[PDB]
């Protein structure tokens, strides 16, 4: 009787931007990201890689409550790189890794049958 809309777990309201950044002023070169309409599916993937990078000092996130569809990511790269660049770099890296996996699977399925 007070359940949320199941279409709202992924759809975004207009007034709220998909992503929201908050610099973390209590330590240097640290940022906190306020996501929207996302969960472990995206957060875990982003975090794994952004941790694998060399110039990232601290990276973490958390799912506030499974009844709400958004999470917050903490990111703090060394002074060498601003966090935004590190995040988009990881984005590109996974993009290309997935593209490679897709291509290999396509070829493998073609040959297999």
């Amino acid at each position: 009787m007070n359940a949320p809309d199941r279409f709202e777990l992924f759809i975004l309201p207009d007034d709220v931007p998909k992503l929201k950044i908050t610099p973390d002023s209590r330590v240097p070169n640290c940022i906190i990201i306020k996501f929207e309409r996302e969960d472990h599916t995206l957060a875990n993937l982003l975090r794994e890689e952004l941790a694998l990078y060399p110039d990232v000092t601290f990276v973490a996130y958390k799912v506030e409550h499974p009844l709400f569809a958004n999470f917050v990511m903490r990111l703090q790269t060394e002074e060498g790189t601003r966090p935004k660049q590190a995040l988009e770099r990881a984005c590109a890296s996974i993009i290309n890794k997935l593209k490679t996996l897709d291509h290999k699977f396509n070829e493998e399925w073609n040959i297999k049958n």
Binding site: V27, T57, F58, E78
Partner: protein
Amino acid sequence: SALFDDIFTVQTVDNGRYNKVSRIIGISTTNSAIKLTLDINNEMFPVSQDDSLTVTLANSLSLKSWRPPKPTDKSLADDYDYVMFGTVYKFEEGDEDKIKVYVSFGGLLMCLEGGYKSLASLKQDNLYILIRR
């Protein structure tokens, strides 16, 4: 910069309950009456009975937020195969020369005996312990 050093023999190794962690009673080679009791992680740095070890206790590693260790930076540990950061929860001013120093590595405790001359400089807050090979 090393506040202590010695070479220790492993008299007895005991596992008992635990599996990944075990207790070793060691005695120094250079100076007897220096009895060492430490608890170490079998998988992370396996050992066995009758072993010999090089022990150091250095206040720092420079030759506050942590970070993964860059390969560019150098540290005293570079020549040892097991490091444990610690803090001293008790600096006993014991008997005539049975002075004991108590360091806890976040659950792994270390009780040490030795001459005041040997332990005079271990009255500190946080201590690293290094083991060669």
